[PDB]
Structure formats: structure tokens, C-alpha cells
Amino acid sequence: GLGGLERFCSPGKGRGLRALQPFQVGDLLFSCPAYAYVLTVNERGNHCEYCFTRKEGLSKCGRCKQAFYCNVECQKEDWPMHKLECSPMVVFGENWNPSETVRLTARILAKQKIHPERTPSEKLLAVKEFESHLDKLDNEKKDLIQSDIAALHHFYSKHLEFPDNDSLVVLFAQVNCNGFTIEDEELSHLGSAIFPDVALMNHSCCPNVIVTYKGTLAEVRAVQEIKPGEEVFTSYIDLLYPTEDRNDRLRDSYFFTCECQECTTKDKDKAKVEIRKLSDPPKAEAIRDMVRYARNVIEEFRRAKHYKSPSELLEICELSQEKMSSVFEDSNVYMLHMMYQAMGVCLYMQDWEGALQYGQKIIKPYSKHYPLYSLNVASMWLKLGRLYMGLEHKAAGEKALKKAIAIMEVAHGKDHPYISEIKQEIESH
Numbered sequence: 001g002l003g004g005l006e007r008f009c010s011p012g013k014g015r016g017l018r019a020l021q022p023f024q025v026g027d028l029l030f031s032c033p034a035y036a037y038v039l040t041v042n043e044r045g046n047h048c049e050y051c052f053t054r055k056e057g058l059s060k061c062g063r064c065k066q067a068f069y070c071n072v073e074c075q076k077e078d079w080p081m082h083k084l085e086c087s088p089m090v091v092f093g094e095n096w097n098p099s100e101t102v103r104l105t106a107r108i109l110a111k112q113k114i115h116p117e118r119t120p121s122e123k124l125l126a127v128k129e130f131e132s133h134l135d136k137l138d139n140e141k142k143d144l145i146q147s148d149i150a151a152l153h154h155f156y157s158k159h160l161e162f163p164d165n166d167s168l169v170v171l172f173a174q175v176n177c178n179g180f181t182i183e184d185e186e187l188s189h190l191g192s193a194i195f196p197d198v199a200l201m202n203h204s205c206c207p208n209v210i211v212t213y214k215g216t217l218a219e220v221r222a223v224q225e226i227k228p229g230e231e232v233f234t235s236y237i238d239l240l241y242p243t244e245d246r247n248d249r250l251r252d253s254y255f256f257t258c259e260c261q262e263c264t265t266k267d268k269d270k271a272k273v274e275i276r277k278l279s280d281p282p283k284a285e286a287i288r289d290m291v292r293y294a295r296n297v298i299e300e301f302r303r304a305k306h307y308k309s310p311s312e313l314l315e316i317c318e319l320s321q322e323k324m325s326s327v328f329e330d331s332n333v334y335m336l337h338m339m340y341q342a343m344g345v346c347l348y349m350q351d352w353e354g355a356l357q358y359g360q361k362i363i364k365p366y367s368k369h370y371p372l373y374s375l376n377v378a379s380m381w382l383k384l385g386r387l388y389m390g391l392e393h394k395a396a397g398e399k400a401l402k403k404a405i406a407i408m409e410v411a412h413g414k415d416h417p418y419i420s421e422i423k424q425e426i427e428s429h
């Protein structure tokens with residue numbers, strides 16, 4: 001068990017984490033070494049496969065030529081996990097396409113054969129003790145696990161001895177309910193992992209902690225004062241959206257409805273869906289209908305980026321904003337989503353000016369919509385600072401980077417490798 005905290009039975013929330021000592025804003029509650037983890041395929045070559053160090057000139061794996069390390073020591077240390085994919089990647093060639101979840105579950109099973117004893121990642125909660133919601137799964141979900149089990153057998157049959165299909169369906173349900181995505185300082189996808197003690201914490205739309213990553217290590221820091229006896233709540237979802245949206249995400253992904261202060265009260269809901277103060281105000285049915293269009297275009301875009309062109313996507317972004325603007329104010333979260341999506345396309349296209357334009361429009365409303373310390377906000381300021389600096393706007397860049405640093409010092413810590421690199425960006429300009 002972790003010092004200063006304890007595992008407990010949270011009424012109507014199963015098992016949780018409770019404080020035994022007071023924690024102040026920016027205080028490290030605990031750190032959890034990754035139990036199992038995997039670097040995302042598009043990040044290969046950018047980051048070391050073993051320690052997740054983003055560094056220039058990484059050593060390639062002579063065999064597969066698709067795994068990169070700091071040195072030979074990272075390579076030897078990652079071999080027990082890398083051997084699950086080394087030869088399969090070359091023997092399957094381009095037929096090699098397991099999903100990140102399948103990839104992660106192959107490594108959970110591998111860690112289980114190698115180290116069946118409780119790991120330093122499980123001082124409070126064990127992988128085997130994970131909640132699965134097996135009895136709550138629909139047909140869509142059960143079919144996804146069945147295609148994942150199929151792919152697990154198809155690609156990882158060489159080194160693993162598999163349990164029955166009932167044990168594999170339970171495991172996949174646990175990974176999908178307790179799995180973590182690792183993001184960088186710009187909230188960009190790096191990989192997926194298993195942090196058992198971090199998964200003991202329950203959800204709140206007003207969390208008292210923020211999870212950050214330092215390589216493959218998860219760090220938990222207070223973003224609100226925590227007093228002895230208080231439960232330690234972290235957010236599972238994006239805190240920008242109104243109550244209904246948040247709870248629709250929670251029920252689909254984690255099979256529960258949140259009763260937190262934000263969800264009970266619904267106080268921040270009206271601010272979130274800001275309506276245009278028109279001389280002829282919009283009707284309640286007109287509002288209900290625009291929120292339906294907004295929730296719909298959001299889904300259409302999630303698909304359209306897999307099959308439409310960069311400029312076809314910016315057109316959706318502009319066209320939907322233009323439609324919504326009649327009823328909705330610029331600060332409305334639905335407008336803000338389409339703006340965020342468009343800034344993402346400009347950043348992809350390497351159109352730094354266009355990205356900076358949408359950035360400038362997003363930032364202020366986005367600031368007030370999220371909690372005081374937010375990874376989303378810190379990343380928006382960071383993007384904005386990096387663009388300003390890029391386009392040689394040194395005064396504005398310095399201001400946005402100093403804002404990103406202020407939040408990041410609380411959530412990541414003053415001593416973080418990300419903050420030292422941002423500080424280095426301000427001193428190089």
C-alpha cells in the first residue's frame with residue numbers, strides 16, 4: 001500500500017482511493033510505473049520503444065527495422081515484450097495490423113507469464129482484480145471483443161499460451177474499462193498502457209487530481225486541496241461538454257452515470273451552450289434542434305477525416321460553424337469543437353497561420369469552460385505559443401508559453417522534462 005493514501009469502498013462507486021494525509025495544489029500524490037505499455041505505430045522512430053524518450057537519432061532494431069531505442073540497454077530491456085512482434089512484423093509483412101488494444105492485451109498476457117507475482121504497479125489494485133462490466137456489454141461490444149480475440153490469436157500465437165475464450169473476453173473487457181492512453185505536452189497520442197493503482201481512482205467532472213506521464217511513468221497531482229478522508233477523483237472524459245454529453249460518454253465507455261457537483265447542479269450547462277442574444281430571441285425548440293445538428297456534425301467529422309481531403313474537412317468545419325452561428329454564440333462548446341477540428345487540419349497541413357487564427361479564436365472561451373488546471377487548456381496555450389514563436393511573434397509566444405508553464409507546473413510538476421524544453425524555447429527566442 002501507498003503512503004498517505006488508502007484503497008476503500010466508495011458507496012455507489014465500487015472501490016476508490018481515499019486520502020489519509022492532506023495534499024496541496026501541485027502536490028505529487030503517487031507515481032505508478034506502467035505494468036504493460038506500447039508505443040503507437042505512427043510514433044515509431046520519434047520515441048524510444050522502452051522508456052518513451054522523445055530524442056533525435058534513435059537506434060533501429062536490426063531484425064524488424066520497426067522498433068527504435070536510446071541504446072542497446074533499452075533494446076535488451078524491451079526484448080521480452082518486443083519479441084511478441086519482432087519476427088511477426090517481418091513474417092506477416094503488411095498483413096501485420098493488430099489494433100493497439102490487441103497489442104496491449106498481448107503484453108498483459110506476456111507480463112502475466114513472466115511475472116505472475118504482484119508488481120510495484122499493483123500496490124493497491126491488481127490487474128486480475130480489475131472491473132470488467134462483462135454482464136453490462138451489448139452485442140456491438142461483445143462482437144468487437146470477438147474480433148479482437150480473433151486478431152490476438154492470429155498475430156500473437158507463437159509465445160503465448162491462451163486461456164479459454166471466457167477468460168479472453170473478461171480480459172478484453174478489463175482493458176477497455178481500465179486502459180490508459182499516453183499523450184504528450186500537445187495532447188498528442190503516444191501509446192497505450194496499464195497503470196493498476198491509477199485505475200483505482202473514480203471519476204468526477206470536477207476532479208481533485210490530474211494524471212500526467214513522465215516517459216511510461218504515470219504521475220498523479222492535486223489540482224484542488226485534498227483533506228484526510230476525502231476521496232481522490234480524476235476525470236475520465238473531456239470536461240468541455242455539457243452534462244448530458246459528458247454522461248453519454250461515461251455510460252458508453254464506463255457504464256455509469258456521474259452524480260458529481262457539476263452533474264447534480266448542471267450550473268455550467270447554460271454557459272456551455274451559449275445562445276446568440278438576438279433582437280428576436282431563438283425558440284426553445286430551435287435550440288434543441290441546433291444541439292441535435294451540433295452533436296451530429298461532430299460524429300460526421302469523426303468519420304469524414306478517414307475518407308475526405310484536408311480542404312474538404314475545413315469546408316465541413318466552416319459550413320457547420322456558419323449554420324450554428326445563427327442560433328449559437330462563438331463561445332458555445334459546439335462552435336469551439338468545430339474550431340478545434342479546423343485548427344487540427346491546419347496544423348496537419350503545416351499551415352501555421354491558419355492554425356494560429358483558429359487558436360486565437362478558441363483560447364479565451366476554452367479557458368473559462370475547463371477547470372482551473374486543465375491539460376486541454378495548457379496544450380492550447382502551448383500550441384498558440386509555439387505558432388507565435390514560429391511565425392516570429394516573440395512577445396505573444398513568450399506570453400502563451402508562460403501561461404502553458406503556469407498550468408503545467410501544477411499538473412506535471414516544476415521539474416518536468418516538458419517544462420524544461422518550453423523554458424528552453426523562450427530563451428532561444
Ligand SMILES: O=C(NCCCN1CCCC1)c1cncc(-c2ccccc2N2CCN(CCc3c[nH]c4ccccc34)CC2)c1
Nearest residue numbers: 101141144173175176177178179180181192199236252253
Ligand atoms: O486514457 C483514456 N482516458 C482517460 C482515462 C481513463 N481511465 C478510466 C479508468 C482507467 C483509465 C483512454 C481514452 N480512450 C481510450 C483508452 C483505451 C486505452 C487502452 C485500451 C482501451 C481503451 N479504450 C477504453 C474505452 N473503450 C470504450 C468502451 C468500452 C468498454 N468496454 C468495452 C468492451 C468492448 C468495446 C468497447 C468497450 C475503448 C477502449 C483510454
Ligand SMILES: C[S@@+](CC[C@H](N)C(=O)[O-])C[C@H]1O[C@@H](n2cnc3c(N)ncnc32)[C@H](O)[C@@H]1O
Nearest residue numbers: 012013014015131178199200201202203254256
Ligand atoms: C477504472 S475503474 C475505477 C475503480 C472502480 N471503482 C473499481 O472498483 O474497480 C472505473 C469504473 O469505476 C466506476 N466508477 C468510476 N467513477 C464512478 C462514479 N463517479 N460514479 C459511479 N461509478 C463510478 C464505474 O463502474 C467505472 O467503469
Ligand code: NA
Nearest residue numbers: 238240340376
Ligand atoms: Na477537445
Ligand code: NA
Nearest residue numbers: 186347383386
Ligand atoms: Na506544433
Ligand SMILES: [Zn+2]
Nearest residue numbers: 048051070074
Ligand atoms: Zn530508451
Ligand SMILES: [Zn+2]
Nearest residue numbers: 061063064086
Ligand atoms: Zn525488432
Ligand SMILES: [Zn+2]
Nearest residue numbers: 205258260263
Ligand atoms: Zn459529473
